[PDB]
Amino acid sequence: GKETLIPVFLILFIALVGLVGNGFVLWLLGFRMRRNAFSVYVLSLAGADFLFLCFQIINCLVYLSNFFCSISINFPSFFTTVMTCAYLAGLSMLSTVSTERCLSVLWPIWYRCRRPRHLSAVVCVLLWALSLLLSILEGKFCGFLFSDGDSGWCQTFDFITAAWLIFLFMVLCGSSLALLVRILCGSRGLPLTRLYLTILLTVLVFLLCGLPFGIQWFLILWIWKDSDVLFCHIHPVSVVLSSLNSSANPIIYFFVGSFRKQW
Amino acid sequence: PCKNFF
Ligand SMILES: CC(C)CCC[C@@H](C)[C@H]1CC[C@H]2[C@@H]3CC=C4C[C@@H](O)CC[C@]4(C)[C@H]3CC[C@]12C
């Protein structure tokens, strides 16, 4: 009732801020600005964040509508799976950005010369395809499509997305660690302080705001089986942190990188 | 469905 309403206003505000940020990033990198090999990843991450933030706006707006106006807007059940696809694709883009930075620092000669030009596009397409495959197959077995599926085979396939999520986190932490070792061992001209500050900032953002929604939604919910406690308190906060993470992602990745020279 | 829903 009232205890859920106060997080939901935070959801709509943070979602609107991240919405206008992701829209600006999408428009700029699509049309106005020249694209690097790396800019494709930021564009894809903004696109993956868009769907998730728009669906958060929908899911809070109809909660306002149901609470005050009581219209009882029942939804199509396949919104959840495309929202899950958006979330997983955003996290995959985060980890792939980290690995691309590590590959650039470790092998500079290969990254300048021998790197294929469409490698960023093919990696983005493959990770989006794998995210969509893990999303709809979690959707069909758990009832978030036309047909309904068994809950017993739901948890077998849902834990696969959780294991993939933990692997996707360990890839981000492992690759950001190797870059730090390389720049702290024998790198001369780089700005070290700003560099480890921004790397550590991305690591804490991805661990504290990106992970908890997925962890709680998939792996945590099934194992705990403490329904009264979990939904009322844990769930509202989990969405907000994950929603917050999507909003802060354009600011961290594109706007700090691009608009630094302007201010 | 099978899931709690949000
Ligand atoms: C196989 C299917 C699921 C992929 C389609 C995913 C859709 C939703 C969209 C979201 C953002 C899109 C990407 C946005 C940016 C570019 C850069 C462009 O130079 C190559 C295409 C590419 C990489 C697009 C590929 C398709 C894409 C990833």
Q: How far apart are CA A204 and CA A212, in angstroms?
A: 12
Q: Residue holding tokens 């992970």?
A: A211
Q: How far apart are CA A32 and CA A104, in angstroms?
A: 26
Shortest Cα distance, chain B CAs vs residue A148, angstroms = 7
What would the two tokens of residue A191 be?
């700005």
Question: Which amino acid residue places its CA nearest to atom 1 of ligand 1?
Answer: A129
Length of chain B: 6
Find all residues with CB under 8 Å of A14, minimum gap 6, and list them.
A240, A243, A244, A247
Neighbour count for residue A48 (Cβ, 10 Å): 27
Shortest Cα distance, chain A CAs vs residue B3, angstroms = 7
Q: For residue A101, report the distance from its CA to the centre of ligand 1, in Å.
A: 21
Nominal resolution in Å?
Answer: 3.0
Domain range for A46: 1-263
Q: Residue holding tokens 């997305």?
A: A161
Helix (H, G, I), strand (E, B) or coil at A261: coil
Nearest CA in chain B to A77: B1
Domain count, chain A: 1
Find all residues with CB under 8 Å of A15, minimum gap 6, and list them.
A53, A56, A57, A60, A243, A247
Q: For residue A213, report the distance from its CA to the centre of ligand 1, in Å.
A: 24
Find all residues with CB under 8 Å of A244, minimum gap 6, and list them.
A14, A209
Neighbour count for residue A259 (Cβ, 10 Å): 10
Neighbour count for residue A77 (Cβ, 10 Å): 17
Whether the CB of A150 is below 8 Å from some CB of chain B: the reply is yes
Nearest CA in chain B to A218: B3
Nearest alpha carbon to residue A241 among A214, A221, A261? A214
Instruction: Verify whether the Cβ–Cβ distance A144 to B4 is below 8 Å.
Output: no
Instruction: Verify whether the Cβ–Cβ distance A144 to B3 is below 8 Å.
Output: yes
